[PDB]
Curated annotation (Swiss-Prot), chains A, B:
Record carries keyword GTP-binding: no
Additional note from the record: The diphthine intermediate is not stable in vitro and readily eliminates the trimethylamino group. It is not known whether the elimination reaction also occurs physiologically.
GO terms classed as biological process: methylation; protein histidyl modification to diphthamide
Swiss-Prot/TrEMBL keywords: Methyltransferase, S-adenosyl-L-methionine, Transferase
Known EC number: 2.1.1.98
HAMAP family, alphabetized: Diphthine_synth
Name of the protein described by the UniProt record: Diphthine synthase
Entry similarity comment: Belongs to the diphthine synthase family.
Annotated GO MF terms: diphthine synthase activity
Reaction(s) catalysed (UniProt annotation): 2-[(3S)-amino-3-carboxypropyl]-L-histidyl-[translation elongation factor 2] + 3 S-adenosyl-L-methionine = diphthine-[translation elongation factor 2] + 3 S-adenosyl-L-homocysteine + 3 H(+)
């Protein structure tokens, strides 16, 4: 009688850890949510096939409002698993679900999986140099979010890189592209005018991390803003001051302009 | 003609992803390094048994100085795998190895796995609030490194959390404990008087992330500095101001004192 939070990883059903798979295979009931992120290289059927269990998919409302009514009751007399894309506790509010488990008298365990938060290491930028992270959210009605702009400014001022998670509307199947994120940032720049994000800003785009051939591109906004980075999901990164080795990798592997090799120490 | 950088994950031999395992099994040659970090919950023998392949371990010199003489040659006419603890390319020196592969006319692909960088999400602390990361190094002789202290100060000053990787003697397989790390930080504080790390500082300890039974503890230095957190590896976190949700998770899941709900939020 336990509840497992198991990550499925970055792109396809094989991104789950062996540990996660062996445990999931022996669970009595398996639930999952696919609104926190997009696994562009698999399907529900393929995941169900690998795990050998029927997976009941829950919506954001089912989880946030009724996790304790849909999942926990069964976990009191059975072995239950809750699957999520990437790592179950990264850039989600799932951690709070463990408190609900505790209050319901259900023990919970966490099985990690590859997360975009660490996968950005494939961009060649030193992981320790990433500062505060942010999410570029779709404007709605008369509300235009801009907090992510201040995050970039604060990090850049310290010479730190900024990871920008991009918005997603799973039910409407809308996945923000790096292009849309850039357009939104240029608009915020025109408004706040802090010289934080302009056409001359160096940015890095990582699309479909986890696949064998993700798209990794670095360059100036003026050149990348209309570039096709392939299918979603996408992540946008605004580097801070670069180490020479970071620049070399962006040039050699991400096709960045050779001029960035000349860092301004 | 192909080199695969495959992550082994967090703690034991089952932390590799299904993708990594299946690729590793089909490789003609398998190399590995255990100097960036160790896999405390398993052994080289258990890893070999799972992959069903003999594994040649490479030292830091083998990699940094002779990667192109030891690994790439075989990668020219065979499928070769390079196993690393955690997620590949999180360790700062690994990215460059992909440039070496390119230079040698060898294709390289990255198969991700869980990293402690993302696994800390299990502490209940929001991942976006983590700032710059640092490593607490053992002082030696006349050398007393303290840059990690400044990292904490700069992050906390901006309300950000600080992830502290603890020193390790890979060869001797000796791990710095969170207790030793706290002792060191108090020493640095007494030297800098920045008021950054004291007996009243709230800290979080995560031990054996990846294991089904990690130790997650939160509390003030004065109370945790002599506490037993179990077997290595240990990770130390100095959180910044907490969101009430983070505090409630630390209290309910990490046994933090109720006091944090009024002092650190
Ligand atoms: N494979 C991938 N490639 C690029 N971006 C990705 C990605 N997976 C997730 N993201 C990014 O992160 C957002 C979801 S945030 C949830 C992240 C998840 N728990 C994890 O551990 O990765 C997406 O909208 C996208 O911007």
């Amino acid at each position: 009688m336990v509840l497992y939070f198991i990550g499925l990883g970055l792109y396809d059903e094989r991104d789950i850890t062996v540990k996660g798979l062996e445990i999931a295979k022996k669970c009595d009931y398996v639930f999952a949510e696919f609104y926190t992120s997009l696994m562009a290289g698999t399907t529900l059927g393929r995941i169900q096939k690998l795990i050998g269990k029927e997976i009941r998919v829950l919506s954001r409302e089912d989880v946030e409002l009724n996790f304790e009514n849909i999942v926990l009751p069964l976990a009191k007399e059975n072995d239950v698993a809750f699957l999520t894309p990437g790592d179950p506790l990264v850039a989600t509010t799932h951690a709070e679900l463990r408190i609900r488990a505790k209050r319901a008298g259900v023990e919970s365990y966490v099985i990690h999986a590859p997360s975009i938060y660490s996968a950005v290491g494939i961009t060649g930028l030193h992981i320790y140099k990433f500062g505060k992270s942010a999410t570029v959210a779709y404007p709605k009605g008369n509300w235009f979010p801009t907090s992510y702009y201040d995050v970039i400014k604060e990090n850049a001022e310290r010479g730190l890189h900024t990871l920008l998670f991009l918005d997603i509307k799973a039910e409407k199947r809308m996945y923000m592209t790096a292009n849309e994120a850039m357009e939104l940032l240029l608009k915020v720049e025109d408004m706040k005018k802090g010289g934080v994000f302009t056409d001359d800003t160096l940015v890095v785009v990582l699309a479909r991390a986890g696949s064998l051939n993700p798209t990794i591109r670095a360059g100036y906004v003026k050149d990348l803003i209309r570039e096709d980075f392939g299918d979603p999901p996408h992540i946008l990164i605004v580097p801070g001051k670069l180490h020479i080795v970071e620049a070399e990798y962006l040039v050699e592997i991400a096709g960045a302009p050779r001029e960035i090799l000349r860092v301004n120490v």
